[PDB]
Design an enzyme around this catalytic site. Structure first.
Site, PDB file in Angstrom:
ATOM      1  N   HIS A   1     -53.827  15.498 -11.393  1.00  0.00           N
ATOM      2  CA  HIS A   1     -53.440  14.119 -11.074  1.00  0.00           C
ATOM      3  C   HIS A   1     -54.695  13.319 -10.767  1.00  0.00           C
ATOM      4  O   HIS A   1     -54.797  12.146 -11.119  1.00  0.00           O
ATOM      5  CB  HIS A   1     -52.520  14.053  -9.843  1.00  0.00           C
TER       6      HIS A   1
ATOM      7  N   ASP B   1      -5.467  -6.581  -6.428  1.00  0.00           N
ATOM      8  CA  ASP B   1      -5.098  -5.562  -7.407  1.00  0.00           C
ATOM      9  C   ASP B   1      -4.980  -6.157  -8.815  1.00  0.00           C
ATOM     10  O   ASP B   1      -5.299  -5.493  -9.800  1.00  0.00           O
ATOM     11  CB  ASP B   1      -3.734  -4.920  -7.074  1.00  0.00           C
TER      12      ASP B   1
ATOM     13  N   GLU C   1     -10.413   1.711   2.764  1.00  0.00           N
ATOM     14  CA  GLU C   1     -10.516   1.327   1.367  1.00  0.00           C
ATOM     15  C   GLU C   1     -10.268  -0.178   1.248  1.00  0.00           C
ATOM     16  O   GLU C   1     -11.067  -0.902   0.650  1.00  0.00           O
ATOM     17  CB  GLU C   1      -9.476   2.080   0.545  1.00  0.00           C
ATOM     18  N   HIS C   2      -9.137  -0.636   1.788  1.00  0.00           N
ATOM     19  CA  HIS C   2      -8.800  -2.056   1.792  1.00  0.00           C
ATOM     20  C   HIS C   2      -8.722  -2.498   3.247  1.00  0.00           C
ATOM     21  O   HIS C   2      -8.044  -1.860   4.047  1.00  0.00           O
ATOM     22  CB  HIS C   2      -7.422  -2.340   1.179  1.00  0.00           C
TER      23      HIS C   2
ATOM     24  N   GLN D   1       0.819  -1.200   0.000  1.00  0.00           N
ATOM     25  CA  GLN D   1       0.000   0.000   0.000  1.00  0.00           C
ATOM     26  C   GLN D   1       0.856   1.256   0.000  1.00  0.00           C
ATOM     27  O   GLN D   1       0.602   2.186  -0.758  1.00  0.00           O
ATOM     28  CB  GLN D   1      -0.913   0.023   1.221  1.00  0.00           C
TER      29      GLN D   1
ATOM     30  N   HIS E   1       2.436   2.945  -3.170  1.00  0.00           N
ATOM     31  CA  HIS E   1       1.550   3.551  -4.156  1.00  0.00           C
ATOM     32  C   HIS E   1       1.726   5.068  -4.205  1.00  0.00           C
ATOM     33  O   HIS E   1       1.618   5.677  -5.270  1.00  0.00           O
ATOM     34  CB  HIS E   1       0.082   3.229  -3.853  1.00  0.00           C
TER      35      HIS E   1
HETATM   36  N1  LIG Z   1      -5.171   1.469  -6.016  1.00  0.00           N
HETATM   37  C1  LIG Z   1      -4.716   0.857  -7.268  1.00  0.00           C
HETATM   38  C2  LIG Z   1      -4.462  -0.654  -7.113  1.00  0.00           C
HETATM   39  C3  LIG Z   1      -3.285  -1.162  -7.899  1.00  0.00           C
HETATM   40  C4  LIG Z   1      -2.971  -1.107  -9.225  1.00  0.00           C
HETATM   41  N2  LIG Z   1      -1.825  -1.850  -9.405  1.00  0.00           N
HETATM   42  C5  LIG Z   1      -1.438  -2.323  -8.228  1.00  0.00           C
HETATM   43  N3  LIG Z   1      -2.256  -1.845  -7.292  1.00  0.00           N
HETATM   44  N1  LIG Z   2     -41.942  14.170  -8.862  1.00  0.00           N
HETATM   45  C1  LIG Z   2     -42.703  13.974  -7.632  1.00  0.00           C
HETATM   46  C2  LIG Z   2     -43.809  12.928  -7.811  1.00  0.00           C
HETATM   47  C3  LIG Z   2     -45.119  13.308  -7.197  1.00  0.00           C
HETATM   48  C4  LIG Z   2     -45.475  13.665  -5.936  1.00  0.00           C
HETATM   49  N2  LIG Z   2     -46.837  13.499  -5.852  1.00  0.00           N
HETATM   50  C5  LIG Z   2     -47.317  13.364  -7.082  1.00  0.00           C
HETATM   51  N3  LIG Z   2     -46.286  13.324  -7.927  1.00  0.00           N
HETATM   52 ZN   LIG Z   3      -1.827  -2.010  -5.281  1.00  0.00          ZN
HETATM   53 ZN   LIG Z   4     -46.910  13.734 -10.001  1.00  0.00          ZN
END
Ligand SMILES: NCCc1c[nH]cn1
Ligand SMILES: NCCc1c[nH]cn1
Ligand SMILES: [Zn+2]
Ligand SMILES: [Zn+2]
Lengths: 431, 431
Positions: A416, A357, A323-324, A256, A259
């Site tokens: 409506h 990776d 992330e990892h 890591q 990088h």
């Molecule tokens: N975060 C990119 C991961 C990667 C690519 N190559 C090796 N490691």
């Molecule tokens: N775009 C919102 C949808 C809606 C609310 N009530 C009726 N129609």
């Molecule tokens: Zn890597």
């Molecule tokens: Zn609507």
């Protein structure tokens, strides 16, 4: 080195220990990337060819790489490599294809049929950083899901001259066009389109500060395009129990770290013994890494934390949302259910980060910098969209009519409500 | 106006018709919203009561609506209305539950197990505009998928005094907390948290210009929160052949038109006679709408386009990608396959827009303003996160090791390669 005894730290010191780098972000680059975009939108290719002089002596001719150039590049690559890539693609393909949302088709009530279907993103542009040793593996990670989703247009931009590995990678995954362009101007070309580069619906792939800024801007402009996800420094968090192997843990922290200097590297373990042995293994392994200045620089922000127990490791990891997440414990699998936030998890002593990776098949394009809170790893879903469909039979509609009129009436939406009455009256007359 | 003959327009005019109006920016509203957000983060509830104090005649005291007030509002509603909401919720629940992803668990190759698991977004905040005619149905559309996803905390903010319907709709869907706050302050309250309002991971629900700007800003700030989707004018596009009923077409156009003076309403029909009849139906129905000034203004930007055939209708709709696609043609379902972009599709004579807005079961929170190009209708997936998990056995790791090293070496990432070598050697040693 320096081990951290978690429970000896104040509550504030703790949250401070895991705080991610602050976002500097200079206006300098915001205005610079602004010029670039406006210029690319107005003067298309002409603008691109100009920038093809400023940065890197490329003085680009034809923006599009020819089929011959790709073929010449593919011939210069070894069979070993080519075969290595086929393995990666095959596995990545198998994992993503498995992500296909099965069709949704149900009648909520008799005669009221509701479906959820999938449509691919019309066109997608892939950005790949250049350089001497480019991370061509990212090509396989972006272009393969794009292929599986059925995107009609898949194009890739990369700073010229584009390495043989990228060209071959693009070709292997079926990328249609590869363009000799990079930086903030490549993003604009994809978002706005030029005489040579097509305007796409979504842009994928990370890059330097400028590229990141450009993506951010085109994602906030009506004339621009959508992007895959925000950026941030990469992160790795390893949970290791007394049964883990110091050298294995260290090799993942270092993977890591190499990088970038901004990489976040964290170890959590309930054994001070383990923390100390991992720090030692990091020291030894580091001394054998060639271009290991960034790795060392990244480690300056690392954290080797000793927790009271395994549960506390899971607790800290979940708050951080790395992330990892690498779980090098004896019952790794069992812990997965208790993990509520992480980009990609690696279980056991034989699942190195590097495996994910390159060839396990998962996607190495992941949410980071805390975005694991709501964002997800790149997958099939990022290259398509869910569209709903409904059809009410005369019976279904008649059964729902009263409900709809009552609701529309409570919201004061006369039209409506009238759309329903008109239809009910039509049916009464035909009954 | 009257009607537009598509093929009689110039190629240029045809391209202009497919474009949507541009928004703006108003440095004034951006600055205002910026000060609101900062003020709320820095001074919490005290800051919220200062705003309530100036905007209302009865400054808010307790920010959290009591369980007592909720029971009172509930008693005041008719059994008819309460029953109607139950039908909606039940159908909304059935449709979204059916969106649950099946397990993704596969061995890309022997010993290399890769999975995709979902995890709910921990906390979500829902915003609902207040006023005379409150669209309480949106509460059902937001809170329902949230409950199904498993979100640990669901809270809702709405401008006081909060209508009985909203309070009831919230209780009905298990919304935990409801707060007397609206506008950009509520968004700020949800995004940052105050003494009373909890900080949430993601914010859902449209609002006025200030709400919209507030959601854009918190989505961009690191100390903020994610948002469901960007906003824009609402739209409806109807495709109707000679067999359509003018009044049915018109009622749907009016249903959308009455949603706001910025609504976009479009009709695409192969029959010039149908366009004329729909135009007349629209005028006759408009004359009966109690207060249709909104609908009236929205119609000034409407487009009733006569095309060559249905094929051209589909072609135009696909380039536009309307929020709502209504297909009133003889072969409705047959066309769906050809529809590559639309938020939600309605089929046949008995599937009014109104039916989908309230009780069919589909979600009415949809992408608009062209965002249909890459964004999906709100759904179960928006209240969840996809997490990747992988575990390679010794056998699996051993079979994939050469590939990883080859690729790692190719990208000149030595530590990545070393993480493999170490493991391979440890396995030799062992056996
Ligand atoms: N975060 C990119 C991961 C990667 C690519 N190559 C090796 N490691
Ligand atoms: N775009 C919102 C949808 C809606 C609310 N009530 C009726 N129609
Ligand atoms: Zn890597
Ligand atoms: Zn609507």
């Amino acid at each position: 080195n320096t081990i951290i005894d978690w429970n000896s730290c104040t509550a504030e010191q703790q949250r401070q220990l895991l705080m991610r780098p602050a976002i500097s972000a200079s206006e300098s680059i915001t205005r610079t990337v602004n010029d670039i975009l406006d210029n690319v939108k107005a003067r298309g290719d002409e603008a691109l060819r100009e920038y093809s002089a400023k940065f890197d002596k490329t003085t680009v001719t034809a923006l599009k790489v020819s089929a011959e150039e790709i073929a010449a590049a593919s011939e210069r690559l070894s069979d070993e490599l080519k075969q290595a890539m086929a393995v990666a693609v095959k596995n990545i393909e198998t994992f993503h294809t498995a992500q296909k949302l099965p069709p949704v088709d149900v009648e909520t009530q008799p005669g009221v049929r509701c479906q959820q279907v999938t449509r691919p993103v019309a066109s997608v542009g892939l950005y790949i950083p250049g350089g001497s040793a480019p991370l061509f593996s990212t090509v396989l990670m972006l272009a393969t899901p794009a292929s599986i989703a059925g995107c009609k247009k898949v194009v890739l931009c990369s700073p010229p001259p584009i390495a043989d590995e990228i060209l071959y990678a693009a070709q292997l995954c079926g990328v249609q066009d590869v363009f000799n362009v990079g930086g903030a101007q490549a993003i604009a070309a994809l978002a706005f389109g030029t005489e040579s580069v097509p305007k796409v619906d979504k842009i994928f792939g990370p890059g330097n500060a400028f590229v990141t800024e450009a993506k951010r801007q085109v994602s906030q402009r009506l004339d621009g395009a959508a992007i895959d996800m925000p950026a941030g420094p990469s992160e790795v968090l390893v949970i290791a129990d007394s049964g883990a192997t110091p050298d294995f843990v260290a090799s993942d922290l270092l993977s890591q770290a190499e990088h970038g200097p901004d990489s976040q590297v964290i170890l959590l373990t309930p054994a001070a013994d383990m923390a100390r042995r991992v720090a030692e293994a990091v020291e030894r392994q580091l001394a054998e890494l060639p271009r290991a200045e960034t790795a060392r620089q990244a480690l300056n922000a690392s954290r080797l934390i000793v927790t009271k127990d395994l549960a506390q490791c899971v607790e800290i990891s979940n708050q951080y949302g790395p992330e990892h997440l690498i779980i090098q414990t004896r019952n790794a699998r069992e812990l997965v259910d208790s993990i509520t936030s992480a980009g990609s998890v690696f279980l056991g002593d034989w699942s190195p980060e590097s495996a994910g990776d390159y060839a396990s098949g998962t996607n190495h394009v992941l949410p980071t910098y805390g975005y694991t809170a709501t964002c997800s790893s790149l997958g099939l879903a990022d290259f398509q969209k869910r569209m709903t469909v409904q059809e009410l039979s005369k019976e279904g509609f008649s059964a729902l009519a009263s409900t709809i009129e009552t609701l529309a009436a409570a919201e004061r939406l006369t039209a409506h409500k009238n759309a329903v009455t008109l239809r009910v009256n039509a049916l009464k007359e035909q009954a």
